[PDB]
Structure 1
Amino acid sequence: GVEIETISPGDGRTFPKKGQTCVVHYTGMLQNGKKFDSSRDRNKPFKFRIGKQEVIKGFEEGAAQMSLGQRAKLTCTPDVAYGATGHPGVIPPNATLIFDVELLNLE
């Protein structure tokens, strides 16, 4: 289940497709919890492409449901990211993830 809560401004037309490499200022958040990751702190804004299963599933579907300059708000189910296993030391099992995602990409 992908639930998009858009902070408005952008263009609404530059949709992410296959064969495109995209640049995202992500910020992870635990529901009823603190932060766990920040691209803003490293200031290396996470260049990646579409269609290689590099990112998790819940983040992958929310990427194409945005456009250039937009700012959504993700809400990922446990089964699409880590909830059966839990990422060791960082994500407990059966967890619900929150992301602040802005798409400032190229191509």
Structure 2
Amino acid sequence: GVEIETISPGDGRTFPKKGQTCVVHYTGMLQNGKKFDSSRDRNKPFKFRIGKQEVIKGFEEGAAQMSLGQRAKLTCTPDVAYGATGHPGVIPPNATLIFDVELLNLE
């Protein structure tokens, strides 16, 4: 389950498609917890493409449901990202993930 909470401004029409390399200022957040990941710290805004299952499934479905300039807010279910496994040391099992995602992309 991917739930989108978009901070309004953007264009609403430039949607990511297959084979398009896109640029996202993401920001990770644990529900009832602190941050765990941020592109704002490294300031390299994470160039990635669509259609290769590179990212987790909760972040993948929310990427296609945004547009250029928009500022959404993800709520990733445990089963789509790590809730069975848990990323060792960083993500516990059965974790519900929160993301601040802005789509300032190319292509």
TM exceeds 0.5?
yes
Q: Distance in 1 between matches of 2:60 and 2:87?
A: 18
**CA offsets 1:80-100 (integer angstroms, 9 cap, x no match):** 000001000000000000000
- Tell me whether 1:44 sits opposite 2:44 in the alignment: yes
| % identical equivalent positions | 100
SS of equivalent residue, structure 2 residue 99: strand
TM-score (norm 2): 0.99
Deviation string for 1:19-51 (max 9, x for gaps)? 110000000000000000110000000000000
Provide the secondary structure at the position in 1 that maps to 2:61: helix
> Gaps (5+ residues) in structure 2?
none
Question: CA–CA distance in 2 between the matches of 1:37 and 1:85?
Answer: 18
- Would you identify which runs of 4 or more consecutive aligned residues in structure 1 move more than 3 Å? none
Q: Deviations over 1:29-81 (max 9, x none)?
A: 00000000110000000000000010000000000000000000000100000
Query: How far did 1:103 drift?
Result: 0.4
Q: Distance in 2 between matches of 1:41 and 1:76?
A: 22
Q: How many residues align?
A: 107
1: CA distance, partners of 2:84 / 2:93: 6
Q: Distance in 2 between matches of 1:56 and 1:47?
A: 15
- Structure 1 residue runs of 5 or longer lacking an equivalent are none
d(CA) in 1 for partners of 2:19, 2:96? 30
- What SS does the corresponding residue of 2:37 show, helix, strand or coil? strand
